[model samples]
Target: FNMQCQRRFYEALHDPNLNEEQRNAKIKSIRDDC
Candidate 1:
């Protein structure tokens, strides 16, 4: 598993700067990485 991906997932989940679409994209990308 990619620990960095997991970290990024949480970061994106709580990131105030990201819109819903951006957040979801970030999450999806992280998931794919893992």
Candidate 2:
């Protein structure tokens, strides 16, 4: 996942690999990343 990406995490959930768990994880990870 592009957790470091500046765009919204929900927006990038368009990526097929990311599930609910991964999406939530990415949100947490990206907060630090942002």
12 Cα displacement, candidate 2 (Å): 3.7
Model 1 per-residue lDDT tens digits across residues 1-34: 5678777877899999989998898888878878
TM-scores for every candidate against the unseen true structure: 0.77, 0.45
Candidate 1: how many backbone clashes? 0
Q: Which portions of model 1 show Cα errors greater than 4 Å?
A: none
TM-score of 2: 0.45
The positional error of residue 25 in candidate 1, measured at the CA in angstroms, is 0.4
Clashing pairs in 1: none
Candidate with the greatest lDDT versus the true structure: 1
For candidate 2, lDDT tens digit of each residue in 1-34? 3543656765656656788788778777777677
- Structure candidate 2, residue pairs in collision: none
lDDT of 2 at 27: 72
